[PDB]
Amino acid sequence: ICSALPTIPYHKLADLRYLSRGASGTVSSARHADWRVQVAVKHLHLDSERKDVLREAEILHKARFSYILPILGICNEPEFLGIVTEYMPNGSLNELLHRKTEYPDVAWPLRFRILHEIALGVNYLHNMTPPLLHHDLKTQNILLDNEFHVKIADFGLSKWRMGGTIIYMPPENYASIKHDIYSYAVITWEVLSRKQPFEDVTNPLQIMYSVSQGHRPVINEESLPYDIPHRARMISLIESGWAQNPDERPSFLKCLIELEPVLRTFEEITFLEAVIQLK
Amino acid sequence: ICSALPTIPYHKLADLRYLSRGASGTVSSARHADWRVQVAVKHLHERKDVLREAEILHKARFSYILPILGICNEPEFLGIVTEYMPNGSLNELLHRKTEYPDVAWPLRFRILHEIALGVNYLHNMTPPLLHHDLKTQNILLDNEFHVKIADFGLSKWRMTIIYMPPENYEPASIKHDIYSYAVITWEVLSRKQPFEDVTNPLQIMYSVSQGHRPVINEESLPYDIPHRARMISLIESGWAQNPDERPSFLKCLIELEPVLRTFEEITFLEAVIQLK
Numbered sequence A: 001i002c003s004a005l006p007t008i009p010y011h012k013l014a015d016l017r018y019l020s021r022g023a024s025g026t027v028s029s030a031r032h033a034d035w036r037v038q039v040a041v042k043h044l045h046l047d048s049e050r051k052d053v054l055r056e057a058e059i060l061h062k063a064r065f066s067y068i069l070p071i072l073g074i075c076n077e078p079e080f081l082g083i084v085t086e087y088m089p090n091g092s093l094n095e096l097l098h099r100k101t102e103y104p105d106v107a108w109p110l111r112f113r114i115l116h117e118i119a120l121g122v123n124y125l126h127n128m129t130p131p132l133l134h135h136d137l138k139t140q141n142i143l144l145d146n147e148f149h150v151k152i153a154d155f156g157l158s159k160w161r162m163g164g165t166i167i168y169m170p171p172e173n174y175a176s177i178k179h180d181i182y183s184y185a186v187i188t189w190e191v192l193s194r195k196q197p198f199e200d201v202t203n204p205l206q207i208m209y210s211v212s213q214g215h216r217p218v219i220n221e222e223s224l225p226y227d228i229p230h231r232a233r234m235i236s237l238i239e240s241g242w243a244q245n246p247d248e249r250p251s252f253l254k255c256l257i258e259l260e261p262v263l264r265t266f267e268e269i270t271f272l273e274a275v276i277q278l279k
Numbered sequence B: 001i002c003s004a005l006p007t008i009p010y011h012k013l014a015d016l017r018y019l020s021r022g023a024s025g026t027v028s029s030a031r032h033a034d035w036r037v038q039v040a041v042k043h044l045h046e047r048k049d050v051l052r053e054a055e056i057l058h059k060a061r062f063s064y065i066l067p068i069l070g071i072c073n074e075p076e077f078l079g080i081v082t083e084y085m086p087n088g089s090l091n092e093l094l095h096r097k098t099e100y101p102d103v104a105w106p107l108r109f110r111i112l113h114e115i116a117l118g119v120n121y122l123h124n125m126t127p128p129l130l131h132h133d134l135k136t137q138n139i140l141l142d143n144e145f146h147v148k149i150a151d152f153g154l155s156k157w158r159m160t161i162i163y164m165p166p167e168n169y170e171p172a173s174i175k176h177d178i179y180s181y182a183v184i185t186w187e188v189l190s191r192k193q194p195f196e197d198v199t200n201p202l203q204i205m206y207s208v209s210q211g212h213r214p215v216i217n218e219e220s221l222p223y224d225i226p227h228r229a230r231m232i233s234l235i236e237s238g239w240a241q242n243p244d245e246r247p248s249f250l251k252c253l254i255e256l257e258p259v260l261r262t263f264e265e266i267t268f269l270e271a272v273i274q275l276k
């Protein structure tokens, strides 16, 4: 049973306003004239580049799931080419963690939920037939919806198993399955500390070396305070996740089995209260 | 660009618990052993009848339409697997008054805006999709009381009788959905069971064919209802005896948008908290 990705004509994307620009592309916010919904469009900043945008779109369409950014349709024209997804009102996990003025408090339940969903998302990808590996996991590629639920995005590097920011990359990369878990491990450390992985390291190559020489972001009372709920288990999960030897890193399944009981501890309402605290 | 619906093995579903028994089949809640998520399973306990609903849901997938995760096409079992909605149906919300004493207007208005957005999408498909079974029991609520439209059993491609227009009494029509929506809209703002007075369902049918509608006084719809008049215009245009008078969903949305903007985001979140 197949499902076709809808084709949207450029002239249906009203209020098309620049949102975010990165190397090679440009993301802009818009509203669908017919559907009456606020969307997001990812377009080119070409002959080969046209195939790339199609790859990502096909992947998002096949990989659709609860925690993967929903792709609403493709906008393919000779004039304009882009990907039409849902609009994520709360940006990326990166912004939430680090814009400490706007967000002075991000209560534990939400952080733990965020980590739980990311792990669910990735696990689903890995459980596809054939498996799909995101290969570009970072806090900027982890979007937050209107209620602060995770939506994994940016399948530009994702590879069907059959740069810029090397902070989330395992040393063996300087298709491997244990690449995503390494990244997840970093994201986890970054989520629980709100610090920047390797703040004191000015040069990406000083990082790349330090990492390949075993070193990882610091784990102590300053980075990961003793009040962090289930700290011991989280640290344990983190350390095993960013382990030097790929084989020593866990599967997302194992990771979820570890996470499940921890998440069962927070009362349903506390996640809602954690979000209202932001609004 | 195509995307296929995966096949889920029955043994991959742990913790099967009954939810609601229906005349067609049963609906259970379970967890997916590999995906590690909660799901809902609608099972036969005709094959084409099921595979149809599944095909539609998989094609009609959108933000306000219940997402289908896969099918169970086994010799020993056949069912549809969708995301589990922890907050049941709109019907239970509006009516289980002892458990839900308050339902703040901002939420109600968002539900209505969302239901309309979903149905609008269905009609805006090529070719258009008509739900034909819209009721409150067929509108499901997620963790935050967002809308997911369900039950595409009576759904048809354009290629309780309470929510059914008079013409469709003896069976076809595009304007089925919009009439249904109008009764929901009434039911959402009232918290009243439409045709509460009437005991004989056939009698209702007679009444409705003679232009009758659910009680539209203030004992049902008070003045304190935000934008009461414009909502009553909406309810009336929709449940019109004459199908030609009934407006499109796009037209309802255009009217609705301004009404929704009058509510601050915070109030939706507040509303939900008051229910948890």
Ligand SMILES: Nc1ncnc2c1ncn2[C@@H]1O[C@H](COP(=O)(O)OP(=O)(O)CP(=O)(O)O)[C@@H](O)[C@H]1O
Pocket: A019, A020, A022, A023, A024, A025, A026, A027, A039, A040, A042, A085, A086, A087, A088, A089, A091, A092, A140, A141, A143, A153, A154, A156
């Ligand atoms: N649906 C959405 N809602 C809000 N912001 C979104 C969004 N989709 C993307 N963005 C923004 O775009 C940023 C990066 O976009 P994304 O990861 O999709 O593309 P990209 O980084 O691969 C651009 P390129 O591939 O052209 O270099 C995110 O940090 C986010 O702020």
Ligand SMILES: Nc1ncnc2c1ncn2[C@@H]1O[C@H](COP(=O)(O)OP(=O)(O)CP(=O)(O)O)[C@@H](O)[C@H]1O
Pocket: B019, B020, B021, B022, B023, B024, B025, B026, B027, B039, B040, B042, B066, B082, B083, B084, B085, B086, B088, B089, B137, B138, B140, B150, B151, B153
């Ligand atoms: N994903 C889901 N999450 C939670 N409850 C769900 C659900 N899907 C269905 N339900 C429950 O079942 C009801 C709707 O089931 P649905 O409309 O799919 O079946 P149905 O009405 O066609 C069965 P029948 O044809 O036998 O009457 C709702 O009242 C709700 O309580």
Ligand SMILES: [Mg+2]
Pocket: A140, A141, A154
């Ligand atoms: Mg990106």
Ligand SMILES: [Mg+2]
Pocket: B137, B138, B150, B151
């Ligand atoms: Mg039903």
